[PDB]
């Protein structure tokens with residue numbers, strides 16, 4: 001009666017969107033188990049951070065014991081040690097576009113490039129790069145819905161003989177109860193690897209004169225014992241996430257524009273240290289440094305010898321999340337994860353939900369304050385996706401949805 | 410007339426046989442460049458995975474698939490790995506894209522802001538250091554990167570490459586090469602480029618042993634002897650082929666069309682049986698990736714006097730080599746019938762043109778069960794009123810077809826929109 005949910009996401013998606021998808025799928029498993037079904041979530045191995053650069057365990061990035069407190073999880077390679085083929089692949093796809101529904105349908109592009117039947121009950125696919133993994137069955141399902149809709153799909157009678165089901169294009173589903181208790185439980189469960197935390201904490205204490213005791217950012221080991229608070233101070237530094245490439249292809253500051261913002265914030269807050277999270281090339285960083293007043297110092301984690309890119313991103317995000325004040329980039333999922341981290345640490349909202357303005361719009365739109373939780377319309381949710389076709393939703397009809405169209409993956 | 414190197418790449422998610430077509434576009438660019446006095450040599454991009462549903466492995470040499478000496482007779486070529494051994498940097502990447510305006514149709518190009526998804530594919534790390542896929546090689550970088558909107562052909566790309574902005578670059582890589590169309594589609598230089606793409610002799614030997622053992626077929630009795638040097642090929646339509654029917658049987662419709670363009674399994678059985686009776690053939694060479702149960706079903710439906718053959722000695726050959734063997738075996742049939750709009754089929758048709766088969770035996774497409782008088786492919790004959798529309802420039806995403814006419818509007822173009830890649 002053990003059942004396994006596997007999943008994957010559109011190949012062109014980034015690390016931080018995938019982290020969001022985890023929570024969608026975790027909540028599906030939570031619902032499944034609350035309805036009496038003994039489902040285990042199989043964690044999909046991580047791949048390349050940059051598309052211009054395989055099979056990495058979650059334990060490199062996240063603390064599995066924390067994830068396990070919300071739902072039972074295992075690594076893909078632990079799933080493989082049960083020597084059971086995958087019974088079913090369901091490839092989610094969109095309806096051409098407020099109505100929750102699903103149906104098995106003919107495969108839209110590009111599903112038939114991704115899976116190939118070689119025998120009656122043998123379908124090949126990428127399967128995270130693992131040779132010798134196959135599925136007994138494959139189909140496409142059009143779906144418009146959330147974790148609850150996916151629960152319903154998974155309990156369909158067509159799969160009642162399947163103990164292992166893989167849901168591809170999992171980013172197709174939305175959150176149920178966006179910004180509410182179960183959303184935040186799923187997010188709170190995603191504690192970073194202790195090894196990453198130790199690395200980041202050594203950097204905080206050495207370079208940023210920052211530690212949990214003086215910063216008032218002590219967190220209990222067990223995230224389920226977290227209590228609400230707004231008393232975090234953080235370290236004596238300004239955290240900035242500085243995105244230079246515009247993945248929406250107007251919305252980002254120039255290099256001088258950024259220097260001005262940083263200088264104003266540093267004066268207003270009496271800060272002399274800046275922790276800069278960026279992949280900007282060295283000459284643009286040097287330009288930015290040269291434009292800053294001489295008493296401000298910029299820091300970056302760059303002792304990255306063994307660390308892969310996802311680990312560095314998490315370190316960057318953890319360092320930003322422990323700043324006294326954070327300012328991030330427009331519509332960036334990297335930024336959104338930092339905002340969530342600061343919510344969990346228990347920082348005042350004013351220090352958290354801040355976005356860099358472009359040079360022409362000094363009072364630009366600032367991000368919605370999705371606050372941790374333990375009518376007029378709500379804010380629109382963040383997009384379900386960072387490239388291609390997705391949706392936002394609004395709640396208070398008591399629920400609404402709209403397309404968000406992003407550039408091609 | 411210092412040595413210059415042209416590298417290129419193609420949209421990920423384009424397939425092997427479309428890439429073979431793009432080669433010819435870029436080979437003709439090099440041929441034009443060299444005809445205009447520019448000492449360019451073409452660097453052959455390593456091959457990736459044949460299937461998008463397979464584990465990417467090490468980047469593969471062209472010599473596994475093609476005879477490099479034959480390619481070299483049209484233009485000078487080198488393997489990427491050999492280009493690397495010269496410790497020559499990559500000076501410039503030009504990432505081709507469409508005009509953001511879109512569009513009558515004019516040949517033109519212009520440096521422009523990068524359309525999606527160029528920013529994901531190349532990343533500046535230092536002033537003169539751009540990272541990118543570079544065929545999966547880690548230490549390879551470019552000194553410069555830009556996007557160029559372009560509408561045109563091999564000639565337009567030649568012009569772009571001779572622009573003064575690049576005159577200090579010895580090594581230029583052109584990405585999204587499938588963005589350019591053929592110049593003079595279906596004419597002499599098109600066919601020279603195609604004729605140059607002789608298959609690896611090791612693949613030819615394997616295929617010929619199969620022909621002789623199973624298909625009662627060899628070049629002497631088939632009248633399909635080709636001269637070793639393709640530049641000495643003369644026009645002839647004297648090929649008769651082996652005593653077998655060649656069929657390329659696609660099951661997945663990569664156009665995801667609303668109405669079926671492929672026959673069913675019973676539909677295919679009927680077609681094969683009818684053709685075998687009409688042509689008095691008892692042997693069928695089947696080229697397909699269909700799963701084994703669909704093939705067994707097809708076999709079971711065929712009259713007991715028909716024998717179906719497939720190359721299945723596969724376990725020291727990669728998938729591209731097998732596909733080439735399949736194509737070569739189909740190309741030596743007395744009669745060939747292929748699948749709608751399939752680039753695999755189109756390459757076979759071109760093979761048969763080179764071997765010198767009557768056009769009737771070549772330009773045949775399998776009809777779906779509901780349209781027994783379905784549209785048949787244009788007979789683009791080898792060359793040594795408006796034309797037909799060219800085949801699409803791509804197999805996924807946005808491309809173009811063109812149509813041409815001579816004298817005594819010379820050319821026109823239209824968008825063709827395919828499923829996403």
Ligand SMILES: *[C@@H]1O[C@H](CO)[C@@H](O)[C@H](O)[C@H]1NC(C)=O
Nearest residue numbers: 103104105139141153156158
């Ligand atoms: C279940 O199978 C039936 C029979 O093919 C099909 O009509 C139906 O759509 C399938 N439903 C799902 C969700 O698989």
Ligand SMILES: *[C@@H]1O[C@H](CO)[C@@H](O)[C@H](O)[C@H]1NC(C)=O
Nearest residue numbers: 518519520521557569572574
């Ligand atoms: C040549 O270089 C200049 C430098 O910005 C640019 O404006 C121009 O468009 C370039 N031309 C081409 C076709 O690369």
